[PDB]
Ligand binder design. Structure first.
Ligand SMILES: Nc1nc2c(ncn2[C@@H]2O[C@H](COP(=O)(O)OP(=O)(O)OP(=O)(O)O)[C@@H](O)[C@H]2O)c(=O)[nH]1
Ligand SMILES: Nc1nc2c(ncn2[C@@H]2O[C@H](COP(=O)(O)OP(=O)(O)OP(=O)(O)O)[C@@H](O)[C@H]2O)c(=O)[nH]1
Ligand SMILES: Nc1nc2c(ncn2[C@@H]2O[C@H](COP(=O)(O)OP(=O)(O)OP(=O)(O)O)[C@@H](O)[C@H]2O)c(=O)[nH]1
Ligand SMILES: Nc1ncnc2c1ncn2[C@@H]1O[C@H](COP(=O)(O)OP(=O)(O)OP(=O)(O)O)[C@@H](O)[C@H]1O
Ligand SMILES: Nc1ncnc2c1ncn2[C@@H]1O[C@H](COP(=O)(O)OP(=O)(O)OP(=O)(O)O)[C@@H](O)[C@H]1O
Ligand SMILES: Nc1ncnc2c1ncn2[C@@H]1O[C@H](COP(=O)(O)OP(=O)(O)OP(=O)(O)O)[C@@H](O)[C@H]1O
Ligand SMILES: [Zn+2]
Ligand SMILES: [Zn+2]
Ligand SMILES: [Zn+2]
Lengths: 266, 471, 471, 468
């Protein structure tokens, strides 16, 4: 629909009743290009393009692949934050069906012989020791709904991590939080580790870095000084719901993660 | 509301069924690999169409029908079941067994009435019952208003219709094959869409027709017979073969159902009749006849048939029991093939060239991802005979273009006689009609006879024992 | 405002209907696979247009109509219907059954008046009522304003119109087929757009026309002839086939409806009247006639027809019952084919060459510097006859250029004999008019004809019983 | 202020119609599949132009008009409606029905006055009224200022104009077909832009013209004839066909409307008149004539026509009833086609070669897929005649250059006349003819008699009996 720009800053209203996830609008790449108002993210529209066809039948048969662009809506934010927020949400949406097509493509046609696709087999719909398993009738990932036909298993079929992020957009924040974002530079493990190790506060939670990085600080603080600091991880903190707000936040190694993801995390 | 038929999901006959019945929706559901599946699908849909246009709470006369088919219907049926056939006992026993097994499990289907009706008839063969009788068409004495025929070729159409109209019937229906090939006095023919072949009694030992059989021989230059012969003409006996089932028929009764548009029935009472065709699909037709009391209008004695597909009739040469003879064969051709052949029949073509071009137009290779399949439009075994017909037709049309006659005169001279040309092929293009001369005035229908009980005591005991249980 | 037609959603005839009726919006829905679907859509739209044009609260007369079609309408209709056809008893029974089935369901229409009207007529047949009567067109005694003839071919146009005029009728309408072919004295013809074929009775045994039937012969040199022929001219008997239904017709009554522009009706009273054409679509026309008392102006006795499509009439050689003869046929050609055919007709072209280009031109055309499919294709079974006609026309136009003659003179050889050149085809290009001489003065209308009833006791009893069903 | 015309929205006639009327804007709207849509659009626009030009305070006379279409008009009209045709009773009945139906609703166009005036004429069919009249153009005794003729070909022009002048008429208009083809004395012709064809009675049984009908049963030798004709010359009777309607005409009355620039009318009073052409579009012209008392200047007796598109006249050979004859025909050619054939006609060309070139130029031309020639510029049934004319014209032009002669002298042996078979008038060319410019015949065709019947009077009065 319409997009209003109050005095430089850009905010988007979600009045269209089309497909929307959480508080993010979904629209075709062609719509973005044909609008001078959305000229700030035209580069992403070109990139998401070259990935939109309407299938094919015959010797070389494929299925229609449609991509979409995700933008935040409803909140008055700076134009710069609009660019980064769209990139993070759009990438996750395009990632999920890329795997979904790959599993669906193997089912209808024959798996390649000189490849690794033999790790995916066709399994009876009754014997389903797999806790989550991919079905073909509805081309989603489902636990137990009596998938008719003959069910597929595979390596990534066991943990559906691609499917574990589609619902994450429902609770994804849109408004950036205003706070003095300071940072420590230089090769890590000199004082920045020691900031959260020897002089960390009571209410801070070590959730940053890889799961190993989350646990090392917890073992480091307890063995050296103590202070009973627990350990969550970035993946669990971002996906699962949050709790009582942290007093002071000491996230480390967040520059590996994307900026838009950090904006929603804070 | 969806109608389910026993057809394979990839059959090409499904498209033809939908265009013939645009008021329904058809979904395939196969449960048995019957050899005549296409012939039964059409019959199933025909009955559904008729019941949709018949006024409810009106009794219906069903002539020569198996009573096990009209059991679950909510209408009122009166079945006329003579016992002059070799498969009647199985139908009667099956009807009794299914009736007994259905008692007490169906709420409202008049099961109790049917049980009582069957027992009453078995006690007295001559009794009349609303839902069952053992008389014939001219012997039943039950009044109604609608009569239905289904695949009946053993009655005389004018005589049978008159007896129905006396009792007060004002509507009738007929379902069956097409009578047109028999009006042209053919020797053999085929219906390729339903896998049906028919032939004459005297050509059952041919070599290259649909229904025949022969054996190997070396050939001798001498053999004597007591029958001079010297004349090969069609007879009254014809054999039918639908799928893997044999049916003997007669030409006289088959031609009696090629009714004109308007005809009069004159006797003790007078009636005026009409005839229309409502459904036609590659050989099967459905006819509707209306009857009124009185005597109105005028008659012309003509019958009209409309061709949606090509109709061919040509002369072929074959060896019957080692002797070379010639007769005529008829068949049907799809419309798409006929339209694409218009270009090359402007010149003279040899039979070999016609056969090769027909094969190319017929067969295509279809690939679905990695699977390969061969698709055909019409049956391949009829191509050689069809290719011959086109070659002869293209030659006869050219000769008419050089020997041009004057306008409005007849050439008749050394002697006052006119020469008659030879004809070897009759070809009817799509969207073309054919007209025949038939009879329209019927006077005599008196066929008195005596009724005899067509039943046996061993059969009567078996039915009674089967219909013996506390429900 | 939308109008529904029983036509397939992918047919090519929908474009033609939209062009002929620009004041409506037509969209298709199919419920029946009728063989004459195109011929009924035109009639349905014609009645809708006529009703809109005329004002309400005006009494309308129907000449030989089915009362069941006008049951649900707002206009005041007076149905005149004698008992002279085999379909009349069926139509009356349908009208009574349908009328009694909606006694307490429809309140807007005058249902009660119609039921009482039918009963009063059934008592005594000599009663004139506002809705129903059992007289002819010259025996009814009901005064109205508008008369409608729908598909009426069995009356004399001058005599019928005069009897309507003396009762105070100012406007009339006619819906039917074009009568232009019958003024050219053709032997056979066709209307490809409506699947209609007609032929003379003397050539019903032809081989290569739309309505014929023959058999296979080997050839008999010399035949007996009790009587002598040498004459082959059209007779008064003509047979029509509209898809699948047969209709006999007469030439004299067919040609009486090709009225001139202005003519006078002078008898006991005098009137002056005109004739105009409002709608024309590939064979179907709608005519409007307005009468006025008194004598005015002068008459010229000329009739004009405007051709929006090509009209052809050629002479062909065929074989009728084994004997070679020649006669003339006529047909219609689409305008698009004619325009694209102009380039090569400047030279001499053989019939074989013309046939090949017609087949190719039937798939692709050029429009506005671009390319598309024809979408206005012609039937394939008439291409051979059309191709031959074009060749003769091209040859004849080249002999006139080589025989240049002086201006203002007419060579004559006391008697003066002049030669007549040969013509074998007549071709009327689009946007060209035909003019002919007809009669424009009629005075002899004296027909002292009595009247008699045509009903019977058995039919009267049935109608009373059907109307006895009060619920 | 847009004007709506009853034609198709994709017709090629829109471009020509808009160019002829640049003071309006034309908008299409189709409600009827009439076969003469082009002919009615021009007449509708012509009346609109005339109405706004004249003073809205004067009185207008109509000659042989239909009063039904003059109802919703803000001007003052005096309709002269005699009873001399089979169409008049229908028009009069329609006028009465419309007047009664629209009574009491539109009380702005003086409906009550018209209703009362019509009733008065019915009672006494000899009175002169401001709105209605029952005499002819000569017998009418009403004084006005402007007279309008619309599609009138049955009145002698000098006689009618003089009778209007003595009643104080100073301006006149005429709308109709072009009379140029009848000055060349042709046998048949056509107006392809309006679907109109005309022919003479002696060639009604031709084979290859626009209005004919022949037979097929033939092929014999020898037809005895009593009279020795040997003559084919045009006669008075001429038949017209517009769409699917037939109109008989006469040559003498058609040629009387080809007036010169200046002419004098002499009699009891004297006047000087001038004729001018305002609008011309492919066959229809609009002429304006002014009258002034007295005698002034001198006349020359010449008529001038300006050609915006090609005009062609040739000689053709055909068979009439089976006998081969020869006569002349005429037609019109679009300007674009004429320009593009300039280079081809430089040499001698075979008729069949010219036909192929014309077909390609007409329906097989493309530039960018936007405009082209609308893939149909000239109707296809007149190409064979046109191709024959160009071939003969080119051949005769080459012979002129091979017979070069001296300047200012002529040779007599007593001189030879060459043969001409084609007259071709290219665009931007004028033609001049000699006509009469002095008229003094004061004929008095005064035999007055009414043509109203008693039954017709009863019907008209009865329709007005009820005020609704
Ligand atoms: N020529 C001919 N064809 C028949 C006759 N009866 C049935 N048919 C056709 O044969 C086709 C297949 O027969 P079925 O439907 O199997 O017959 P059924 O009623 O199931 O019982 P059976 O005759 O014992 O097989 C039917 O569709 C009919 O069109 C007959 O009496 N004569
Ligand atoms: N030559 C001729 N054509 C007719 C006549 N009556 C109807 N037709 C045309 O043939 C077509 C056949 O009409 P149907 O589809 O059968 O419908 P119907 O006329 O209401 O009912 P029927 O009595 O069966 O004809 C009509 O649409 C007419 O255009 C007739 O009497 N003579
Ligand atoms: N040659 C000739 N053309 C006429 C005449 N009257 C009208 N026309 C032309 O015919 C064309 C078509 O109009 P018509 O179809 O006759 O209908 P109308 O003019 O609206 O009204 P009507 O005269 O009642 O038919 C008009 O544009 C006129 O230019 C006439 O008397 N003679
Ligand atoms: N006159 C009749 N009236 C009513 N039903 C009949 C009559 N004749 C036969 N039938 C029934 O129709 C069916 C045909 O019986 P038919 O004697 O023809 O058997 P058939 O010997 O196999 O010959 P066909 O193959 O031609 O049917 C039987 O079921 C029979 O009950
Ligand atoms: N003189 C008439 N006046 C009114 N209606 C008539 C007249 N003659 C016939 N009809 C009606 O024409 C309708 C059908 O035409 P007709 O009576 O000629 O039947 P037909 O013998 O089949 O000939 P056709 O093929 O021309 O219809 C009948 O319903 C009849 O009522
Ligand atoms: N002298 C006249 N004055 C006024 N109107 C006239 C005169 N003569 C004819 N008209 C009118 O011109 C119209 C054309 O009718 P006309 O007299 O020419 O006979 P027509 O044969 O019907 O037409 P036309 O001869 O032009 O083809 C009529 O309405 C007529 O009233
Ligand atoms: Zn019975
Ligand atoms: Zn009546
Ligand atoms: Zn006057």
């Amino acid at each position: 629909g319409i997009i209003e720009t109050p005095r430089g800053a850009i905010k988007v209203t979600a009045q269209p009743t089309d497909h929307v996830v959480g508080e993010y609008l979904v629209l075709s790449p062609q719509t973005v290009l044909r609008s001078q108002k959305l000229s700030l993210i035209h580069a992403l529209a070109e990139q998401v393009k070259t990935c939109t066809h309407s299938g094919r039948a015959g010797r070389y048969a494929v299925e229609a692949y449609d991509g979409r662009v995700l933008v935040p809506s409803g909140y008055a934010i700076s134009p710069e934050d609009f660019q980064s927020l769209s990139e993070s949400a759009t990438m996750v949406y395009n990632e999920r069906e890329f795997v979904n097509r790959k599993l669906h493509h193997i089912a209808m046609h024959g798996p390649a012989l000189n490849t690794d696709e033999e790790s995916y087999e066709l399994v009876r719909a009754e014997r389903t020791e797999h806790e989550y398993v991919y079905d073909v009738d509805q081309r989603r990932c489902c636990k137990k709904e009596e998938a008719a036909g003959l069910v597929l298993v595979g390596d990534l079929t066991n943990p559906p991590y691609h499917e574990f992020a589609y619902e994450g957009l429902k609770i994804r924040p849109a408004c950036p939080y205003k706070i003095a974002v300071i940072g420590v530079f230089g090769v890590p493990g000199s004082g920045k580790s020691a900031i959260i190790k020897n002089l960390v506060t009571r209410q801070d939670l070590v959730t940053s870095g890889k799961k190993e990085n989350c646990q090392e600080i917890t073992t480091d603080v307890m063995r050296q000084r103590g202070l009973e600091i627990s350990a969550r991880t970035v993946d669990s903190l971002l996906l699962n719901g949050c709790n009582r707000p942290v007093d002071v936040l000491y996230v480390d190694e967040a520059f590996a993660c994307h900026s838009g993801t950090l904006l929603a995390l804070i | 509301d969806p109608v389910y038929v026993d057809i394979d999901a990839d059959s090409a006959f499904l498209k033809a069924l939908q265009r013939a019945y645009p008021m329904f929706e058809v979904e395939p559901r196969q449960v048995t690999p019957n050899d005549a599946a296409n012939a039964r699908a059409f019959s199933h849909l025909a009955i559904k169409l008729i019941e949709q246009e018949i006024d409810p709470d009106s009794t219906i006369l069903d002539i020569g029908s198996a009573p096990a088919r009209r059991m679950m219907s909510d209408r009122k049926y009166h079945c006329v079941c003579p016992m002059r056939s070799a498969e009647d006992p199985e139908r009667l026993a099956n009807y009794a067994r299914k009736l007994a097994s259905a008692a007490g499990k169906v709420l409202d289907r008049n099961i109790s009435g049917k049980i009582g009706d069957l027992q009453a008839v078995m006690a007295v063969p001559d009794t009349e019952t609303p839902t069952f009788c053992l008389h014939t068409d001219v012997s039943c004495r039950q009044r109604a208003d609608v009569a239905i025929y289904q695949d009946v070729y053993a009655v005389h159409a004018p005589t049978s219709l008159y007896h129905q109209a006396i009792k007060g019937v004002r509507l009738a229906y007929w379902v069956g094959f097409d009578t047109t090939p028999f009006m042209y006095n053919a020797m053999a023919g085929a219906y390729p869409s339903y896998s049906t072949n028919w032939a004459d009694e005297q050509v059952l030992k041919a070599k290259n027709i649909g229904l025949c059989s022969t054996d190997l021989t070396e050939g001798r230059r001498g053999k004597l017979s007591i029958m001079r012969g010297k004349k090969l003409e069609p007879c009254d006996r014809v054999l039918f073969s639908v799928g893997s089932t044999l049916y003997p028929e007669s030409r006289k009764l088959l031609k009696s159902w090629h009714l004109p548009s308007v005809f009069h029935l004159k006797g003790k009472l007078s009636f005026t009749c009409r005839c229309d065709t409502v459904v036609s699909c590659e050989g099967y037709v459905v006819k509707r006849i209306t009857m009124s009391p009185g005597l109105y209008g005028k008659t012309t004695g003509y019958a009209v048939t409309h061709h949606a597909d090509g109709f061919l009739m040509c002369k072929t040469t074959d060896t019957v029991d080692g002797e070379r003879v010639s007769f005529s064969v008829c068949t049907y051709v799809p419309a798409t093939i006929c339209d694409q052949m218009t270009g090359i029949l402007a010149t003279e073509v040899t039979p070999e060239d016609a056969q090769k071009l027909l094969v190319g137009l017929n067969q295509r290779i279809v690939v679905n991802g990695r699977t390969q399949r061969n698709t055909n439009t019409m049956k391949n075994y009829m191509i050689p005979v069809v290719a011959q017909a086109f070659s002869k037709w293209a030659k006869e049309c050219r000769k008419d273009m050089e020997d041009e006659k004057l306008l409005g005169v007849r050439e008749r001279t050394c002697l006052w006689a006119f020469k008659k040309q030879k004809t070897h092929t009759v070809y009817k293009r799509p969207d073309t009609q054919s007209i025949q001369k038939v009879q329209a005035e019927f006077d005599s229908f008196v066929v008195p006879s005596l009724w005899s009980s067509g039943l046996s005591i061993p059969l009567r005991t078996r039915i009674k024992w089967l219909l013996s249980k506390v429900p």
